[PDB]
Every structure is written in C-alpha cells, then in structure tokens.
Design a binder for this molecule. Structure first.
Ligand code: HEC
Ligand code: HEC
Lengths: 126, 126
C-alpha cells in the first residue's frame, strides 16, 4: 500500500508511536500509581493487540529507511521470529486483561516490555 | 495519557496517518484497478474501524497544536458531531465489507471520504 519507501517508513513509525502510547499509558496502572479498572484495561489491551499486528507489513522488501537496521531484511526469518514472539507476549497480556487479573497483567506487561527491547537491541538504530 | 500537548499532537497525527493508509489503500479496489477479495477487505475495514475511533481522544482540552484549528475546542459539541458522524459512516463501510458487497462498499467508501473532507474543511488548517 506504499507508493515509496518513505511512505512505509512513515506508516511503521506512526504505528509504533501508537503502540508505545497504548503500552506505556498502562505503566501507572501496573505500578499502582493509578487505579485499576478491569474494563478499561481490557479495552486498551484490545486496541494494543490490533496495533501490535500493524508495523511489520511496513518493513516489506526494499523499505530500508528511518531508524530500521539494515539486518531486518538480510535476516528476514529472525526478524519474523522477533515480531511473532512479541505478538505472542501481547496475547499473554490480552489473556491477563480479559481475566481482570492485575498480578497477571503486571507480569505480562513486563514480558511485553522486554520483547520491545529485545527487538530494538537487534534491529533499531542507535 | 499525554505528558505535554505535543505528545497528543504526535499521537493524533500518527493515528490519522494510519487511517489514511487503511482507507486510501482500498481506492484501487473500489475503482476496479485491483481485484476484490471480500475477506481481505473485511479484515482491512475492521482495522480501519479500530483506528477511526482513536484520534478524537487526543484532541483533549488544551492540546492545541499541529494543523488543528482552534474551533475544535471552542465548538466541542460540533466537533463531536463531526467525528461521530464520520464513525457512523465507517459503520456503513463495515456493514458493506462484512456483507461482501462491492457496490455497497463503493458507495460507503465515497461517503466516508466525504466525511473526512467535511471535517477538514471546518477543522484542519490550510
Ligand atoms: C521488532 C520486532 C520490534 C518490536 C517487537 C518493537 N519495535 Fe519499536 N521499533 C522497531 C524498529 C525497527 C523501529 C524503527 C522504525 C523505523 O523505520 O524508524 C522501532 C521504532 C519504535 C519507536 C519510534 C517510532 C517513531 O516515531 O519513529 C517507538 C516509539 C517504538 N519503536 C516503541 C516500541 C514499543 C513500546 C514496543 C513494544 C510495546 C516496540 N516498539 C516493539 C522494532 C520493533
Ligand atoms: C474531524 C472529525 C476529522 C475527520 C473525520 C478526519 N480528519 Fe483528518 N485531520 C483532522 C485534523 C483536525 C487534522 C490535523 C491534526 C493535527 O493536530 O495536526 C487532520 C489531519 C489528517 C492527516 C495528517 C496527519 C499528519 O500526519 O499530520 C491525514 C493524513 C488525515 N487527517 C487523513 C484523514 C482521512 C483519510 C480521514 C477519513 C478517512 C480523516 N482524516 C478524517 C480532522 C479529521
């Protein structure tokens, strides 16, 4: 759906910004600094689940650019494992949120965050 | 969820970029320049439905900035009508996509596009 590589870069950066917000906005809740309302978190996590599927199709062949490392494309099976593992960690978070279980939510949130960082360490410049 | 107004601006601009892509990528399909696969469009429109609910909470009080006109906030009931009417037009598109009806999809796509433009004309600078 992208006319130029820059359009795929803009798309993925936008998608990743919206993850970051739907992930990160739960930080005060998992820390107990903000109240836990199970319905509101269940709804937020379902938005995050949708968003978390979106960036990867905007790293298609030839869409080098942005802060993406060039190994995303030379190592496509490894990049695919990292995004699939991340999305699997999101499924854990969805199960916790759907269950209304704040201890499970806390644990799953930490696992998701570690999976963001695992990908960054391999595949994000800087 | 936004520490500064700039963070709400970045969020809404990202959300609106991802709409634009999930809307606009269907243009060749509604024109017949690309093939119509009912399942693929049904799935795309459900992403667009999720995305189309997101921008509006990032125009909260005091988040002036970007290319947003200042009337978004002085006229909050009118802005709310425009986003709700837009989302209602998205429901029409979802019904068409869920039905696998390309003529209904065409018509609903045009109505959605007109609703994007109606809001821009009132509320987007330039
Ligand atoms: C690989 C499988 C990734 C996972 C999982 C996550 N991120 Fe990431 N992120 C990735 C890359 C390759 C890039 C660079 C994209 C580019 O072309 O520039 C990023 C970038 C971000 C950004 C910045 C987006 C921007 O506005 O430019 C943010 C805010 C970001 N990533 C956040 C983030 C979070 C919170 C994640 C887990 C919830 C996450 N990312 C996972 C690669 C991958
Ligand atoms: C009001 C109820 C709107 C509707 C419906 C749509 N858009 Fe819009 N759009 C709106 C505003 C106020 C702005 C400016 C936001 C800001 O703070 O700068 C926009 C902006 C866009 C953009 C640019 C995003 C960017 O990267 O900066 C795009 C691509 C865009 N809008 C597309 C778009 C489409 C395709 C719509 C219908 C499917 C649509 N918008 C509806 C206000 C509103």
């Amino acid at each position: 759906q992208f006319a130029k590589p820059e359009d795929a870069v803009k798309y993925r950066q936008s998608a990743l910004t919206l993850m970051a917000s739907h992930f990160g906005r739960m930080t005060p809740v998992v820390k107990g600094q903000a109240p836990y309302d199970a319905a509101q978190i269940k709804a937020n996590v379902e938005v995050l689940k949708t968003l978390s599927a979106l960036p990867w199709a905007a790293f298609g062949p030839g869409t080098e650019g942005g802060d993406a490392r060039p190994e995303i494309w030379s190592d496509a099976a490894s990049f695919k494992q990292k995004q699939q593992a991340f999305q699997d960690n999101i499924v854990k978070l969805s199960a916790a949120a759907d269950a209304g279980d704040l201890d499970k939510l806390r644990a799953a949130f930490g696992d998701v965050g570690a999976s963001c960082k695992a990908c960054h360490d391999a595949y994000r410049k800087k």
